[PDB]
UniProtKB/Swiss-Prot annotation, chain A:
The lineage of its organism: Viruses, Riboviria, Orthornavirae, Pisuviricota, Pisoniviricetes. Inhibited by pyridone-containing alpha-ketoamides compounds 13a and 13b. In turn, alpha-ketoamide 13b (tert-butyl (1-((S)-1-(((S)-4-(benzylamino)-3,4-dioxo-1-((S)-2-oxopyrrolidin-3-yl)butan-2-yl)amino)-3-cyclopropyl-1-oxopropan-2-yl)-2-oxo-1,2-dihydropyridin-3-yl)carbamate) inhibits SARS-CoV-2 replication in human lung cells. Inhibited ex vivo by michael acceptor inhibitor N3. Inhibited ex vivo by compound 11a and 11b. There is a cross-link at K3, K88 (Glycyl lysine isopeptide (Lys-Gly) (interchain with G-Cter in ubiquitin)). It catalyses: TSAVLQ-|-SGFRK-NH2 and SGVTFQ-|-GKFKK the two peptides corresponding to the two self-cleavage sites of the SARS 3C-like proteinase are the two most reactive peptide substrates. The enzyme exhibits a strong preference for substrates containing Gln at P1 position and Leu at P2 position. Residues 1-299 are cytoplasmic. It comes from Severe acute respiratory syndrome coronavirus 2 (2019-nCoV). It comes from the Viruses. It is found in: Host cytoplasm; Host Golgi apparatus; Host nucleus. Changing M47A: Does not affect ability to cleave and inactivate human TRMT1. This is 3C-like proteinase nsp5. The gene is rep. 3CL-PRO exists as monomer and homodimer. Only the homodimer shows catalytic activity. Interacts with host FBXO22; this interaction promotes the proteasomal degradation of nsp5.
Curated annotation (Swiss-Prot), chain B:
It catalyses: TSAVLQ-|-SGFRK-NH2 and SGVTFQ-|-GKFKK the two peptides corresponding to the two self-cleavage sites of the SARS 3C-like proteinase are the two most reactive peptide substrates. The enzyme exhibits a strong preference for substrates containing Gln at P1 position and Leu at P2 position. Residues 1-296 form the Peptidase C30 domain. The active site is at H37 (for 3cl-pro activity), C141 (nucleophile). This is 3C-like proteinase nsp5. Changing Q185A: Does not affect ability to cleave and inactivate human TRMT1. Residues 1-296 are cytoplasmic. Cleaves the C-terminus of replicase polyprotein at 11 sites. Recognizes substrates containing the core sequence [ILMVF]-Q-|-[SGACN]. Cleaves and inactivates human TRMT1, preventing tRNA guanine(26)-dimethylation of tRNAs. May cleave human NLRP1 in lung epithelial cells, thereby activating the NLRP1 inflammasome pathway. May cleave human GSDMD, triggering alternative GSDME-mediated epithelial cell death upon activation of the NLRP1 inflammasome, which may enhance the release interleukins 1B, 6, 16 and 18. Also able to bind an ADP-ribose-1''-phosphate (ADRP). There is a cross-link at K1, K86 (Glycyl lysine isopeptide (Lys-Gly) (interchain with G-Cter in ubiquitin)). The chain holds residues 3268 to 3563 of 7096 of the full protein. 3CL-PRO exists as monomer and homodimer. Only the homodimer shows catalytic activity. Interacts with host FBXO22; this interaction promotes the proteasomal degradation of nsp5. The lineage of its organism: Viruses, Riboviria, Orthornavirae, Pisuviricota, Pisoniviricetes. It is found in: Host cytoplasm; Host Golgi apparatus; Host nucleus. Changing N138A: Does not affect ability to cleave and inactivate human TRMT1. Inhibited by pyridone-containing alpha-ketoamides compounds 13a and 13b. In turn, alpha-ketoamide 13b (tert-butyl (1-((S)-1-(((S)-4-(benzylamino)-3,4-dioxo-1-((S)-2-oxopyrrolidin-3-yl)butan-2-yl)amino)-3-cyclopropyl-1-oxopropan-2-yl)-2-oxo-1,2-dihydropyridin-3-yl)carbamate) inhibits SARS-CoV-2 replication in human lung cells. Inhibited ex vivo by michael acceptor inhibitor N3. Inhibited ex vivo by compound 11a and 11b.
Amino acid sequence: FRKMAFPSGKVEGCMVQVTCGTTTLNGLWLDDVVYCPRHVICTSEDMLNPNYEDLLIRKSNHNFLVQAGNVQLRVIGHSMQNCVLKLKVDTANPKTPKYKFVRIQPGQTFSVLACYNGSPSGVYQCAMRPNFTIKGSFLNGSCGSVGFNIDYDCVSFCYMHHMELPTGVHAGTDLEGNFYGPFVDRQTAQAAGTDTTITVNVLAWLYAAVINGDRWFLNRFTTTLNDFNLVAMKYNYEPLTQDHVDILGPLSAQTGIAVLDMCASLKELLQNGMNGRTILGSALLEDEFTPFDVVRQCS
Amino acid sequence: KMAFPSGKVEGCMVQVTCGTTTLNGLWLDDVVYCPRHVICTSEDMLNPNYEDLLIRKSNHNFLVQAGNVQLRVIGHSMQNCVLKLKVDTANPKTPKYKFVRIQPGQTFSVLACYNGSPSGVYQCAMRPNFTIKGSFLNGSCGSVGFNIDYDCVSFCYMHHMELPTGVHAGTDLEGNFYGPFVDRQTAQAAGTDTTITVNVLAWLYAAVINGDRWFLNRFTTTLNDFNLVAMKYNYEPLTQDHVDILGPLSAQTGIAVLDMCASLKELLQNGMNGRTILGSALLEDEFTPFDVVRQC
Ligand SMILES: *[C@@H](O)[C@H](C[C@@H]1CCNC1=O)NC(=O)[C@H](CC(C)C)NC(=O)OC[C@H]1C[C@H]2C=C[C@@H]1C2
Ligand SMILES: *[C@@H](O)[C@H](C[C@@H]1CCNC1=O)NC(=O)[C@H](CC(C)C)NC(=O)OC[C@H]1C[C@H]2C=C[C@@H]1C2
């Protein structure tokens, strides 16, 4: 199994750069609106603790330089929605895909198109950790890079990048400007909750192992969801939600292994360890492949 | 693990059908490139005589679809294991491009496609035994691998087959296989694979830059003494050019190349002792020094 990103072209066609003064970051051009992190209006010294409302009152449309490549896009209106700036422009992006804005749950994966100066650099697959950080590759200038999934022809934008935490992990918002997790866009020391293992994805990985004929860990037992959740927390695993049980439906149907039976198998692995064995050629249980990701790759 | 943005290549993918065989093609200017085994039936694939099969085909036996639009084939030729279909329409999305043949150990991005439609993108290395550890399913043939420098796409790989071990094999865009493989439906084994040493070192430097350095030691080693141990463990030899290529990473961390070689030697001989490096229980060898530097 590989970490596999979505093809990035539909998103590449929407990336622009947004500059205020000497502060440049990336923005997302869809129809006649450009979306970007609001801290573009900050001087490096204002980031220490900004008054975003006051900073924005001092700004007019003519203070924003929006460029697709080196071609300027005229700004004709501006507003702030939570931690994102919305810049109305006078041209509708002809490369606008079908799209929607979605807010993802921890454990879900998405592709990130890492951009600098409005130019795409690379694409890679990320998982939202239970503590609402992602383990990305972001350098200075990457803010406004977005995360997305593609279904049929429709791009679901789920993440916009805003900051790095002292531990090296990354934090950001949805495209309505609401942060994932307890973070704020200020240049202050912030810490994430202790992280935990994404149980639903581990289960997905065990199903993937079964599909490929690696099934020594299946046992004759089952468990209740509540008993499993209480044990899992003792091992720093996330509890399962009803939605987790449901998104494992397809893999459970494909293998004929009930979700709660697989939970009983995982519980035994947690309590007894691997006893020197491997699963899918690995002594470690993988937690960054979702049930959808497994299905994508097995077919 | 980071792939190049795939948009410039997505604009070139089309579907190619002959008989009941469908796969992907690469549409550049007015030529579509695709694996020649699209002309085969099931019976043909066992032991195909491609020159003989091809002479019995006419332009009109090839159906090329760019989305909903059929392109008319007005000519066809075969270059090694690649078929070239001339069409009456030029692709306006053709990027600036080159065809290159990559060396083992080098990396590239793969745009996996099915029925002419892009499905996913990921980074691959050309293995020393000239296989690639890909993610390719039925219908993925004609998917391509590439690198992007400035605005120029360098195509280096077209996908043709899977081996019994689950790894993959294919050609450059001149239709010559990487490795001792043939485009026939028969079980083929690869030579013994080895680990790409210069890439393991680059990845160890990456682990340090990101604050992970439990595996370091104060020891050192000569280049030849390291290479003796490397070969024993089926690692590729490290050349002086490899050492030179690692310089920037050495300077950046202040760890001399041969000091990192001494760390790797200790890892090969003692294992990781249950510990991990950048999250992995195994030494990763599909990041080049360039891949690591760019991303830092
Ligand atoms: C995008 O503008 C940038 C992205 C950062 C740069 C390094 N890697 C990233 O992910 N964000 C940025 O500089 C933000 C800006 C504020 C207004 C939110 N601040 C930031 O990333 O601060 C990083 C922290 C972590 C410790 C080191 C520096 C400070 C403290
Ligand atoms: C593309 O047409 C297809 C891609 C394969 C299909 C499964 N995964 C892949 O990478 N190639 C293909 O079917 C070739 C065709 C011949 C003429 C080269 N054959 C092939 O890949 O054989 C299937 C594998 C699976 C095991 C049985 C036969 C070999 C090993």
